[PDB]
Amino acid sequence: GAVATGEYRNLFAEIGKSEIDIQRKIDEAFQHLFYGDAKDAAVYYQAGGNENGPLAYVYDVNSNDVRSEGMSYGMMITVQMDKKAEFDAIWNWAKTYMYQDSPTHPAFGYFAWSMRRDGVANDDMPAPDGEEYFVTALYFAAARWGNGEGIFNYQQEADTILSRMRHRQVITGPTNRGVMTATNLFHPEEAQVRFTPDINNADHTDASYHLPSFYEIWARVAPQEDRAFWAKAADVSRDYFAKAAHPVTALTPDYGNFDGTPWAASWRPESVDFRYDAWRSVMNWSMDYAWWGKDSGAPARSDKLLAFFETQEGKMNHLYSLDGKPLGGGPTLGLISMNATAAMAATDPRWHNFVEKLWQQQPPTGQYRYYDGVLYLMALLHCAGEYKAWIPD
Numbered sequence: 001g002a003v004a005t006g007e008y009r010n011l012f013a014e015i016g017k018s019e020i021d022i023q024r025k026i027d028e029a030f031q032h033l034f035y036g037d038a039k040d041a042a043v044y045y046q047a048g049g050n051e052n053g054p055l056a057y058v059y060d061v062n063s064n065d066v067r068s069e070g071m072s073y074g075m076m077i078t079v080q081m082d083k084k085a086e087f088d089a090i091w092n093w094a095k096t097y098m099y100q101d102s103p104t105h106p107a108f109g110y111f112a113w114s115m116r117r118d119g120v121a122n123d124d125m126p127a128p129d130g131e132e133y134f135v136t137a138l139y140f141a142a143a144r145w146g147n148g149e150g151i152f153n154y155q156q157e158a159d160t161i162l163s164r165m166r167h168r169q170v171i172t173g174p175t176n177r178g179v180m181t182a183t184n185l186f187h188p189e190e191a192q193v194r195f196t197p198d199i200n201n202a203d204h205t206d207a208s209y210h211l212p213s214f215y216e217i218w219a220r221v222a223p224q225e226d227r228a229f230w231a232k233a234a235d236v237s238r239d240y241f242a243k244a245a246h247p248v249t250a251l252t253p254d255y256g257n258f259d260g261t262p263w264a265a266s267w268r269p270e271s272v273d274f275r276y277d278a279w280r281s282v283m284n285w286s287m288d289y290a291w292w293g294k295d296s297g298a299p300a301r302s303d304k305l306l307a308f309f310e311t312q313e314g315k316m317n318h319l320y321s322l323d324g325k326p327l328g329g330g331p332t333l334g335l336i337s338m339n340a341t342a343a344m345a346a347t348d349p350r351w352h353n354f355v356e357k358l359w360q361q362q363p364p365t366g367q368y369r370y371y372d373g374v375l376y377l378m379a380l381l382h383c384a385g386e387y388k389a390w391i392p393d
């Protein structure tokens with residue numbers, strides 16, 4: 001795997017692109033999304049400063065809010081690209097406005113998943129994929145830049161958050177939504193990430209939240225007492241993808257049960273289909289395979305997904321039933337980007353076409369540019385061999 005060797009595959013180079021052009025493409029993407037036109041191109045916004053210095057947020061234009069997903073993706077992209085100033089401003093904003101520090105609040109230790117741009121929470125509860133990316137990006141920051149102090153003690157912050165993700169007790173208390181009860185973010189017996197710690201829907205998961213690539217990092221650098229738990233979560237997620245992904249298409253549902261079956265949320269029953277969340281599953285298993293080489297099922301799963309999308313040439317939707325019936329929409333940059341990341345594990349040379357498809361894209365503009373753009377930039381980094389495991393001491 002790439003971590004053992006230190007050699008990350010540059011998939012664009014493998015399909016013939018020059019280093020200079022690959023650098024241009026990444027730099028273009030970053031400049032557009034972080035510094036492009038404020039009304040049409042950017043997702044990064046400077047938001048003044050406080051005692052920790054500059055503040056900035058990643059704007060979910062798609063839904064007119066700031067999400068923990070976006071903030072955590074922003075931190076991952078910026079640490080991968082060695083953009084410490086931007087990283088620190090985003091983290092300051094998350095730690096200042098999103099982080100719940102009150103021990104009598106049910107979200108204690110976590111980050112409010114949906115915020116307004118002025119720092120006011122829409123929902124105090126967390127979205128655990130946010131936390132997963134925050135922790136990992138923080139460990140990567142510690143590896144690349146070393147640890148500062150206070151909120152900038154990246155490794156100490158990571159350790160604390162990750163420990164709490166496992167060990168948080170049940171808390172009932174007031175929130176912006178009324179009294180709520182929430183638990184830990186990983187199920188202790190299943191060793192799987194939850195869809196929500198809200199006790200009302202706590203015993204479910206989401207295949208796109210399974211990040212064995214990252215759990216391997218935690219298994220090496222977390223607080224010693226939790227390392228076996230994270231190693232277990234990595235094994236469990238690999239098995240999870242084998243059960244959750246449809247056997248013909250390798251499409252996964254947005255939401256799931258611990259046993260691998262789709263879960264229909266009462267407020268969103270179409271969560272049993274392959275939609276916006278599930279686009280990311282292939283990236284998660286493919287990254288894991290590329291880095292660690294342990295998911296023996298990943299190459300066949302990536303080949304199946306790409307074979308399926310080849311059948312959709314010229315009529316690609318972006319919403320599907322798990323057996324491959326189109327459920328609406330046209331092609332999106334986000335899905336193109338995610339499908340390209342399947343090339344981190346695929347063996348069939350049709351992968352060349354998916355990587356080439358991502359190469360041909362431009363950065364996104366307009367109202368839906370956030371979800372498209374953050375996936376695009378992450379996919380560009382993966383496919384360029386520039387998204388690495390930065391493992392701290």
Ligand SMILES: O[C@@H]1[C@@H](O)[C@H](O[C@@H]2CO[C@@H](O[C@@H]3CO[C@@H](O)[C@H](O)[C@H]3O)[C@H](O)[C@H]2O)OC[C@H]1O
Binds near residue numbers: 128198276
């Ligand atoms: O009370 C619980 C709610 O707080 C909970 O809200 C969900 C929290 O996560 C949201 O998902 C994020 C945004 O959409 C995806 O693309 C991201 O990957 C996630 O970070 C989800 O949409 C909210 O419904 O819902 C359940 C309640 O019990």
